[PDB]
């Protein structure tokens, strides 16, 4: 379910909240993985409640 991944092991996840999705019209968070090897790679989108916009 993660798009990019770490060569050997992941260090942590960084969660960035973006508010209202323009297409899906739901709250969403962009999820990244911080690797031990390199740094930040986009992992996935996490969906929240329905949305106003």
Tab-separated table of C-alpha atoms in Angstrom:
chain	number	residue	atom	x	y	z
A	1	UNK	CA	0.000	0.000	0.000
A	2	UNK	CA	3.049	2.298	0.191
A	3	UNK	CA	4.218	3.628	-3.205
A	4	UNK	CA	7.922	4.272	-2.651
A	5	UNK	CA	9.754	2.306	0.043
A	6	UNK	CA	13.089	2.216	1.846
A	7	UNK	CA	16.071	0.133	0.658
A	8	UNK	CA	16.590	-1.663	3.998
A	9	UNK	CA	14.378	-0.084	6.691
A	10	UNK	CA	12.110	2.892	7.339
A	11	UNK	CA	13.067	5.371	10.060
A	12	UNK	CA	9.696	7.060	10.610
A	13	UNK	CA	6.488	8.220	8.950
A	14	UNK	CA	5.677	11.904	8.431
A	15	UNK	CA	1.977	12.830	8.254
A	16	UNK	CA	0.987	16.065	6.504
A	17	UNK	CA	-2.640	17.185	6.775
A	18	UNK	CA	-3.909	18.990	3.668
A	19	UNK	CA	-7.558	19.722	4.399
A	20	UNK	CA	-10.237	19.370	1.746
A	21	UNK	CA	-9.489	17.242	-1.295
A	22	UNK	CA	-10.534	19.075	-4.469
A	23	UNK	CA	-11.620	15.885	-6.280
A	24	UNK	CA	-12.725	13.464	-3.533
A	25	UNK	CA	-14.068	16.306	-1.308
A	26	UNK	CA	-12.936	14.582	1.887
A	27	UNK	CA	-10.352	15.653	4.412
A	28	UNK	CA	-7.027	13.994	3.621
A	29	UNK	CA	-3.449	13.580	4.834
A	30	UNK	CA	-0.421	12.962	2.653
A	31	UNK	CA	1.755	10.268	4.233
A	32	UNK	CA	5.505	10.095	3.632
A	33	UNK	CA	8.161	7.654	4.822
A	34	UNK	CA	11.482	8.927	6.111
A	35	UNK	CA	14.016	6.228	5.308
A	36	UNK	CA	17.210	5.392	7.100
A	37	UNK	CA	18.999	5.451	3.719
A	38	UNK	CA	17.633	8.450	1.841
A	39	UNK	CA	14.960	10.748	3.172
A	40	UNK	CA	11.414	11.565	2.251
A	41	UNK	CA	9.298	9.586	-0.144
A	42	UNK	CA	5.547	9.828	-0.721
A	43	UNK	CA	3.795	6.775	0.716
A	44	UNK	CA	0.025	7.191	0.480
A	45	UNK	CA	-3.062	9.328	1.077
A	46	UNK	CA	-5.149	8.836	4.241
A	47	UNK	CA	-8.842	9.776	3.975
A	48	UNK	CA	-10.863	11.660	6.578
A	49	UNK	CA	-14.474	12.777	6.885
A	50	UNK	CA	-16.705	14.384	4.286
A	51	UNK	CA	-15.831	17.867	3.296
A	52	UNK	CA	-17.090	21.352	2.614
A	53	UNK	CA	-14.522	23.062	0.371
